[PDB]
Amino acid sequence: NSMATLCLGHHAVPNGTLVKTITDDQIEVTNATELVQSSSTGRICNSPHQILDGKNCTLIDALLGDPHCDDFQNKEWDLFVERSTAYSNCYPYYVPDYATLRS
Amino acid sequence: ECNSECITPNGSIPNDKPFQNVNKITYGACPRYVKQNTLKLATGMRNVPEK
Amino acid sequence: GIFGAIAGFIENGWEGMVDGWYGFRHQNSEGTGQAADLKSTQAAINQITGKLNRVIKKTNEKFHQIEKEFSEVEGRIQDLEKYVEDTKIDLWSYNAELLVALENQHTIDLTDSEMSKLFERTRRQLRENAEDMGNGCFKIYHKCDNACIGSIRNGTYDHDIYRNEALNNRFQIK
Amino acid sequence: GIFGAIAGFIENGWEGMVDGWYGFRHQNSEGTGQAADLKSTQAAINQITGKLNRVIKKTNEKFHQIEKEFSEVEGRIQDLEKYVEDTKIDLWSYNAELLVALENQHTIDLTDSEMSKLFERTRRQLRENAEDMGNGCFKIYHKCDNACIGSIRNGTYDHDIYRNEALNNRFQIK
Amino acid sequence: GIFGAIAGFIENGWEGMVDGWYGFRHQNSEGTGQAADLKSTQAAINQITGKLNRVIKKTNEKFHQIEKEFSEVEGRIQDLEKYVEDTKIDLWSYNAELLVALENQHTIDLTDSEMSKLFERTRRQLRENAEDMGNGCFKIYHKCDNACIGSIRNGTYDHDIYRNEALNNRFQIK
Ligand SMILES: *[C@@H]1O[C@H](CO)[C@@H](O[C@@H]2O[C@H](CO)[C@@H](O[C@@H]3O[C@H](CO[C@H]4O[C@H](CO)[C@@H](O)[C@H](O)[C@@H]4O)[C@@H](O)[C@H](O[C@H]4O[C@H](CO)[C@@H](O)[C@H](O)[C@@H]4O)[C@@H]3O)[C@H](O)[C@H]2NC(C)=O)[C@H](O)[C@H]1NC(C)=O
Ligand SMILES: *[C@@H]1O[C@H](CO)[C@@H](O[C@@H]2O[C@H](CO)[C@@H](O[C@@H]3O[C@H](CO[C@H]4O[C@H](CO)[C@@H](O)[C@H](O)[C@@H]4O)[C@@H](O)[C@H](O[C@H]4O[C@H](CO)[C@@H](O)[C@H](O)[C@@H]4O)[C@@H]3O)[C@H](O)[C@H]2NC(C)=O)[C@H](O)[C@H]1NC(C)=O
Ligand SMILES: *[C@@H]1O[C@H](CO)[C@@H](O[C@@H]2O[C@H](CO)[C@@H](O)[C@H](O)[C@H]2NC(C)=O)[C@H](O)[C@H]1NC(C)=O
Ligand SMILES: *[C@@H]1O[C@H](CO)[C@@H](O[C@@H]2O[C@H](CO)[C@@H](O)[C@H](O)[C@H]2NC(C)=O)[C@H](O)[C@H]1NC(C)=O
Ligand SMILES: *[C@@H]1O[C@H](CO)[C@@H](O[C@@H]2O[C@H](CO)[C@@H](O)[C@H](O)[C@H]2NC(C)=O)[C@H](O)[C@H]1NC(C)=O
Ligand SMILES: *[C@@H]1O[C@H](CO)[C@@H](O)[C@H](O)[C@H]1NC(C)=O
């Protein structure tokens, strides 16, 4: 027949991912990547930042020297962790400007 | 015991993404807290299946 | 489609082309075949990898900030602490939302650019020896065996040695 | 014009075309006429409606925020409350300003895309039977009555049955 | 390159063309020459000057804001003052970073638009009297002296008076 034919094109995928653009709320592309970390383990990794578990002590009880917080004397942290289970067991006190001091 | 640069009240999270929806309260090398639960960034072309 | 090629004049994408993003599909006297174009494939990938790398980079460690949950009612100072944080979050959410939108539209459009860029490169390559059929395919007006097709792809196609035949085939009556 | 069609190679827009955005205007042995192309018209409209819908969506109810006007001098705590709000407003004004700019530039450019997309669709449709006159019009080298024109628009134009005539008309001397 | 012209099908930019941005370079029986195209040159410049002016405009005087460096530890009120300012700076840095990115990509792309716009303007101008060689040059199929070239640039080129010669030169055998 003294002829031939040549087609040009692009690929596709059986499945696809819907993404948002300027003009479209949903539009399908061959793939995409998720930019929002939406999930967690539920557990705090003890490295690399130095974690100090406050356990049954609050930071202020640990500061003042509440007897059940003797284990916290002269300790350091990158992050001090206060637990809801914490309590106080010493003389009744009031820290005006509590939040500032804790901070 | 594990290793993670970003800490929230909900546990540590991966900071390989740019945004996060775990908690507005964070510590360390964390993703930006946003309100969205998902943001798909297209890495391919317009997918036009055959049939 | 902005450049009007993907979902514009090309009807479908090739689900069976899994060795590249853009490519060639042909038919001649020696049968049919298909092979990817690694230039335009890699070009699209490079642009996308570039912006992907550029979006996905880390920020500064943030250390001791303000309280964002409050156990007691404090009024004015708390109102402000809440207001500041909320303001922040809305703005960052906005930026993210917009970023993705702009980026995605651009990705859609740059890949459409690469499609037409490939098509035009070929159209020029073939000079007067073939015609645009409208659907992203060319009609070749001369015998073009598998070796010939392999000179078009790979850009080693001298049109001048086929020119004579092609012109005679193009300009007849019916 | 980015795609170079509207205010680029097309001289004017058609103030008398009020049945569409893009369309055809012609002259032949049976007189002159005009009719809109609903495909490209609707395409531009869909894109714009999409982004319009996407811009114009509501936000969260906002309830008890901070005071933003003050009747007395309070110094440091007021200074901050004012500073926070002002900061916020500048950033939101910026976002708005930029949003409109980007969107508008894109709207200008996507409608220019649709113009060239239509033109190229037709240029391919007509194969070798007509020539690009430069101003957004084609010179048809064969008799093409109103019925013929109505096969070009509506994409039912088989070029092959006119090809013979057109080639003879295209390749003469003067 | 998005429009695929600069660093796409044009191999190099002309370091010796210092009288414009876009232009023409030619060879004929009377030798070689070069001259700039002031239309497309000025068009690119106008767009860029416009956005440049638009980016570079001043803001409001800002007067008595908050303290941003502190000589003493104050805790909660200072924590907030620091937090507000830091938040602000991150957001403004972001906006700036993004602005430049978008603008630069657009500038790259609009100048590529102007290149192809010029090329297409010429391709249409020349009708059937010349062929696209692929590298941003045209092959003229008729004698075209310096005066002739000076009618192509300057858009006073009537193709019809050369058409006859050109067709005969285009459609021979070898
Ligand atoms: C469709 O969309 C998907 C979504 O994932 C894309 O998938 C991604 O593809 C890229 C490219 O291959 C993957 O990137 C790879 O990540 C590996 C994991 O390394 C991580 O390790 C630690 C984990 O703590 C991090 O700190 C670190 O920064 C990395 O995040 C890397 O190992 C890879 O690099 C090297 O790995 C091999 C290992 O032998 C080396 O030999 C190579 O030289 C290579 O350079 C690589 O960077 C990415 O992980 C994929 N996503 C996911 C979720 O896994 C698709 O690419 C896209 N398209 C297709 C067709 O799927
Ligand atoms: C942080 O604070 C929490 C809460 O106060 C402490 O948890 C309690 O710790 C005490 C002291 O170690 C535990 O007391 C032990 O209780 C066992 C069960 O008895 C009662 O336990 C709970 C709490 O009262 C009741 O709800 C339950 O119904 C039982 O009636 C006893 O078996 C233990 O007896 C012996 O324990 C050891 C020897 O093994 C010695 O101390 C004595 O010989 C003692 O006789 C003891 O009485 C209590 O059980 C803990 N609570 C719970 C729910 O288990 C944490 O210890 C404290 N510190 C941290 C977490 O580091
Ligand atoms: C196309 O050009 C490339 C130049 O790299 C050639 O690629 C070779 O292809 C043959 C198969 O035909 C392989 O055996 C070689 O290993 C390839 N070489 C490289 C460096 O990739 C190819 O030969 C050219 N096309 C034709 C039809 O010969
Ligand atoms: C173009 O294609 C459309 C297919 O829908 C045809 O549209 C019809 O146009 C005629 C007028 O010529 C109307 O009477 C019909 O009601 C239209 N039908 C529909 C479904 O819209 C049209 O006939 C085609 N063009 C020509 C020249 O026949
Ligand atoms: C191109 O058109 C312009 C119209 O302005 C002409 O420009 C003149 O060029 C000549 C040199 O050939 C100068 O002497 C004149 O001063 C120019 N006039 C202006 C107003 O710029 C030019 O003549 C046209 N091209 C040719 C080949 O004649
Ligand atoms: C399947 O779709 C997912 C998105 O849900 C995508 O990440 C993946 O690349 C797709 N894989 C295939 C083989 O289509």
Residue numbers in the entry:
A (entry chain A): 8 to 110
B (entry chain A): 276 to 326
C (entry chain B), D (entry chain B), E (entry chain B): 1 to 174
What did the original publication write about this model?
Here, we describe the unique human mAb H3v-47 that mediates very broad neutralization of H3 influenza viruses by binding to an unusual conserved epitope on the side the H3 HA head domain.
To further investigate the antibody epitope, we determined the crystal structure of H3v-47 Fab in complex with H3N2 A/Minnesota/11/2010 (Minn2010/H3v) HA, at 3.57 Å resolution. The position of the binding region suggested that H3v-47 cannot block the sialic acid-binding pocket, which is consistent with the observation that H3v-47 does not exhibit HAI activity. A total area of 1061 Å2 is buried at the antibody-antigen interface (511 Å2 on HA and 550 Å2 on the Fab), where the heavy and light chains contribute to 61% and 39% of the Fab buried surface area, respectively. H3v-47 targets a unique conformational epitope spanning the RBS and vestigial esterase region in the HA head mainly using the complementarity determining regions (CDRs) H2 and H3 from the heavy chain and L1 and L3 from the light chain. A total of 23 residues from Minn2010/H3v HA participate in intermolecular contacts, making a total of 18 hydrogen bonds (H bonds)/salt bridges with both heavy and light chains, as well as 96 van der Waals (VDW) interactions. PheH54 from CDR H2 (a signature residue on CDR H2 of VH1-69–encoded germline antibodies), and ProH100a, ProH100d, and TyrH100f from CDR H3, mediate the hydrophobic interactions with the HA. For example, Lys82 in the antigenic site E makes one salt bridge by its side chain (Nζ) with AspH64 (Oε2), and eight VDW interactions with Gln61H and AspH64, mainly from its main chain. The structure of H3v-47 in complex with H3v HA revealed that a region close to previously defined antigenic site E, containing the natural variant E82K, is a key site of vulnerability.
